[PDB]
């Protein structure tokens, strides 16, 4: 799939203290490369990838500044929205934003995006053409009118089309060894026989870099996905992922089943049996 640079903002109101807490994480594809946390003492934007550590104080001074400004503005956004919903000061609330650019095949923007959510409900999205907003309710209509009066949809469109893509291309270069190399899954089958219930065959894939993978089980030249248990792809915590698929088969039939693995880091689709 095409490369992506994405930023994820979370604000939480803290009414015990009458203040807020603010997080950002930056991603290129499935690699976190920066964070910020407004509760950190002398809070700054910190690298979370080796290949970004090299950036000078000039880079960190700008991101840290944006982060602090956003921590301040996002405090009052939470107050604003609480007013729009005529809500108590009792409760905690969350305001999320995400935005980013995909890198098209002719080195231009392919699909830029930008969206917000109050208490996990869609509030506003920038439209596909990036020249207009869609608002989910009466409160969101207030925010949308202000953004329209401020011509902010063209500011986002210029950013997504300009800086976002450009810095995606720079990051992809800086981290090409990790970011552009596909690690194929290390795979095996495990067998767990039971009292009197059938044998469980588990097909493991571990240490693959791009998150996207397909596991399936087949018997004699027919798919079996129908009754197979498939866990959600999970981080290994070293930047790779893992996944397994399991099914129960009659005692003695274990070699009648093959696991099929599809991942973009393999030369050919792969076939496993216990």
């Amino acid at each position: 799939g095409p490369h992506s640079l994405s930023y994820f903002y979370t604000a939480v109101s803290r009414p015990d203290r009458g203040d807020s807490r603010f997080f950002i994480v930056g991603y290129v594809d499935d690699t976190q490369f920066v964070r910020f946390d407004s509760d950190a003492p002398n809070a700054k934007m910190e690298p979370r990838a080796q290949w970004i550590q090299q950036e000078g104080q000039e880079y960190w001074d700008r991101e840290t500044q944006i982060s602090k400004d956003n921590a301040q503005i996002n405090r009052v956004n939470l107050n604003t929205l609480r007013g729009y919903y005529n809500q108590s000061e009792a409760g905690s609330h969350t305001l999320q934003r995400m935005y980013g650019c995909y890198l098209g095949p002719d080195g231009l923007l392919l699909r830029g995006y930008d969206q917000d959510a109050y208490d996990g409900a869609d509030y506003i999205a920038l439209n596909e053409d990036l020249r207009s907003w869609t608002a989910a309710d009466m409160a969101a209509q207030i925010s949308k009118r202000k953004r329209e009066a401020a011509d902010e949809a063209e500011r986002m469109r210029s950013y997504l089309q300009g800086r976002c893509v450009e810095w995606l291309q720079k990051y992809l270069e800086m981290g090409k060894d990790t970011l552009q190399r596909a690690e194929p899954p290390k795979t095996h089958v495990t067998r767990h026989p039971s009292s009197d219930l059938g044998v469980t065959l588990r097909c493991w894939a571990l240490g693959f870099y791009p998150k996207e993978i397909s596991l399936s089980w087949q018997r004699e030249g027919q798919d079996q996905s129908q009754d197979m248990e498939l866990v959600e792809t999970r981080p290994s915590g070293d930047g790779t992922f893992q996944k397994w698929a399991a099914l129960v088969v009659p005692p003695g039939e274990e070699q009648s089943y093959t696991c099929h693995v599809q991942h973009e880091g393999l030369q050919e689709p792969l076939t496993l049996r216990w």
């Binding site: 930056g26 700008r62 991101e63 982060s67 953004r147 810095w167």
Partner: peptide
């Protein structure tokens, strides 16, 4: 690098 311009609620 991040967006630095207005995002009004």
């Amino acid at each position: 690098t991040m967006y630095s311009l207005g995002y009004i609620f």
